[PDB]
Amino acid sequence: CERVVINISGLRFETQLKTLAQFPETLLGDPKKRMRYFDPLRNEYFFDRNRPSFDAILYYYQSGGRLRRPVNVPLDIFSEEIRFYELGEEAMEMFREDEGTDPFFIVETLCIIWFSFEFLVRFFAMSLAILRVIRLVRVFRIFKLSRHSKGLQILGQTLKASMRELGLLIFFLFIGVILFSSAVYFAEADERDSQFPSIPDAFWWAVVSMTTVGYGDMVPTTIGGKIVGSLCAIAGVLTIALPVPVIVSNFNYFYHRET
Amino acid sequence: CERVVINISGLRFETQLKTLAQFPETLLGDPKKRMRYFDPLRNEYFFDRNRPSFDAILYYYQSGGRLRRPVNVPLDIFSEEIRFYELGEEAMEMFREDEGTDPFFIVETLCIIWFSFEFLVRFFAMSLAILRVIRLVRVFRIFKLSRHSKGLQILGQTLKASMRELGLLIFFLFIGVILFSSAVYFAEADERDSQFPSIPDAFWWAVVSMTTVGYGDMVPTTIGGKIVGSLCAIAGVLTIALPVPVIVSNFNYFYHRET
Amino acid sequence: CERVVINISGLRFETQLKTLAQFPETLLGDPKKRMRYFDPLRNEYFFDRNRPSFDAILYYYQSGGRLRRPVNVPLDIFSEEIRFYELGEEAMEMFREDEGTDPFFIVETLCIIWFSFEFLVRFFAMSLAILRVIRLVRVFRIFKLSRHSKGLQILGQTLKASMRELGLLIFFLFIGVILFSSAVYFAEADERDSQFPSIPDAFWWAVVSMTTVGYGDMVPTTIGGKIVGSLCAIAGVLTIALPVPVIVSNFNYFYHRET
Amino acid sequence: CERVVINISGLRFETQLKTLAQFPETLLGDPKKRMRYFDPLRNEYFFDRNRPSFDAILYYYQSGGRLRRPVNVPLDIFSEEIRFYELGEEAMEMFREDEGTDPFFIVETLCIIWFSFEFLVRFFAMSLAILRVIRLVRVFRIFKLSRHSKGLQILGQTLKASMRELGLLIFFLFIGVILFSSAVYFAEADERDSQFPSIPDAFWWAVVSMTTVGYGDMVPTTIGGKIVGSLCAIAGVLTIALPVPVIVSNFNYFYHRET
Ligand SMILES: [K+]
Ligand SMILES: [K+]
Ligand SMILES: [K+]
Ligand SMILES: [K+]
Ligand SMILES: [K+]
Ligand SMILES: [K+]
Q: Which of A178, A161, A162, A181 lies closest to A245 in space, CA to CA?
């Protein structure tokens, strides 16, 4: 099948004419558009342009549509070329995406009034329950700032996306606490003056020993509780120092991408 | 020796004909297979394909079999080319790999019964010992989840592989604790009200000061115990913050590779 | 428009003559300067030089001035080429930048005297206020070392530049402490022996639980205070372990760039 | 000056003959050695070899000796080429490097005897001083293992090399402790029940608050001591989390390079 020669600043490219006919609207696929760059003396089309980029521009046609930016070609440059060669806004975006008492009442009432008002205006434009209700509505209040603080949105999108990541930290943390709250429970017990009788309390210690917080409300006195204490102080920093790189790589990405 | 010219979208490659005969089954090595792409006018074989990839495709023959994917060529693309040129499933994989009271009894009995049953069904398809036995079988129980929790397998494979890494953390931790539990022992002693008489107890402090847990069950009161305490708080975070990058790079790899 | 051919060690480049006339002072743009490298037999200018670099050297003219160093070309090499081709000191720098009781009184008086003297010599060359004044002038004294200690300058430039980064850590820390000092306040209260009555004190705990310092002056005794305590020990290490990579990447850069 | 053409698997290179004469012993510089690869029909030397590598092989001569391995060319491959082209062992290495009661007495005496014996055999093949002598010889004893433990050597070489790095951590730690042990000293004092009278003791707290160890032997009770306590818990983790990446990058390098 009749072949074409494209010269990009001395670098010669060759393809069949049907390969370019696969995208009739692009500059190279449109006879009338590329006609301006034909050299009758050499029988080739010449372009005084960026050499590194054309590799992909041609592969686009041969691949049926794949438009990847060569790793060694800047983003601003390669974008200009896609524009010049007239690849089309569709493929253009596809590339883009593939590439990237009273005072308390007054304050409480004023907010409920403003919030509801603003909410409605924008939208339109028993004894035991009282204990659980105050901890809910009053505690999650801070979440309102997320609507005016860019940072929170980033923190949220990262959590929603890296949920599987966090799920491991907690999971691994469990197996850890369970294994340590048990290994010390068997060596800490059967000894007087030891504040490690039950297991439920051994859970707190472990959670306080793995995160390295160490309040001092519970500490091993026996030899068997210290051996598992050292392994715990280590296993903790080891287990915790895992999902971090992931969440950070996600946050830093969501942060840099949003900004 | 008679040479051949291969034109890949304008980029010309040249090699001897025996070099290609070294792999008679591949497309380029098989006369009958490459015959379809010969251009009589130019005396060369033409391929309307990916330019960046062919560099390696040719080196494969010249190297006697080495099939490396150019750093600047996507994985999905280069794979297609290996397929087209018909390099062979062997070399193909080789590339792949080179590239990547009653309730307690009931619960206890039910499990032992189910586990043993499931185990057998799947397979077929004195006073001091009682103290060490309860800490063993009962503590390692959690390890059963590893068979239904992907995460654990990753954590295990990383440990089994980065064993030499962890061995250092503990090793370095030793030398550290030994050096600190001794430097403070000589400056903390010979002083009343000091809870640092013996060395074995100095070990606990050091292990609790390097991991930065600091329960508060032991703290320097002398000037010589604080100087070594500062160096300890530092040396600890320095020694611990070493094998981490390795274990993480292993975990993150085993995690991303498994997923 | 009359075209030119430039041969760089066998690699042929082609451009129009006006493209090179866009920078009349450079070697390639100056007829008298490039005349020395013209080959009459082939009708092309030949240069026995670095191939990888010329890609950019030519793009410079086609782009109207863009001078980027190819990712695969060393800095010392590409710099030499820019010099040879005589691109010009301007574009040269632009590239550079786009690329990178008595003793107390005596001591106090002597300093004030020396400092003021040195300052002037270099420049030319009520009861409640006394409490706030001593904490100010006397505390910020150390900042004087910054003028003789390179390290501080780096620490400062990184802070001044990554201010938005730090602003998040503190911000996120707030929302965290507010949410935790409240979630535990509702579960820690309504229970005797609990040292978590007020909220202002719950703030201290949270700040001491998220940074993982854990002095032991405050710890959850209830079940509801421990559940939020575990989430706090985690959320803390998660929130803190975020701006770090940024500040470090800034510090390490400012450090390596300054040195 | 008479020019030469080198064809590397279809990729044509051109240089002057003197450029190659600059290294008379290499294959390309030796008439008798390159004669075997000359093609009389095309007037060029042909090599059925790796294309990516030759770029550097030629630059070596043009540069007067610079032998850099292209970023996109494997180490094992490029090495083979340097060998084939016969560049010379010198340049070869240069490239390599540019590229990479009684029991106590018995035990004490036996060691002193063995050590001194082994030392000599290998080499040949008052009251206050007693307090400082026991802390020295007895404490640094562990350092003997470094001769049989690879890990320590790595830890040492990294310290000796990244000394300037560590010097900052300690330095920055100083300025920090000095600024915090002073900011809290002015707000913690003038208040009863406060364990922060003197400054020397404020130093311990700061060092225990920045490393996040928090023994609990000292904690702010005033409002002014807590505000500076939060800034301290942060500034600490910020200052410490700086030299880490450096020491790690050095250790990981010294570790991977040694192994
Ligand atoms: K800690
Ligand atoms: K701690
Ligand atoms: K603590
Ligand atoms: K504590
Ligand atoms: K305590
Ligand atoms: K940490």
A: A162
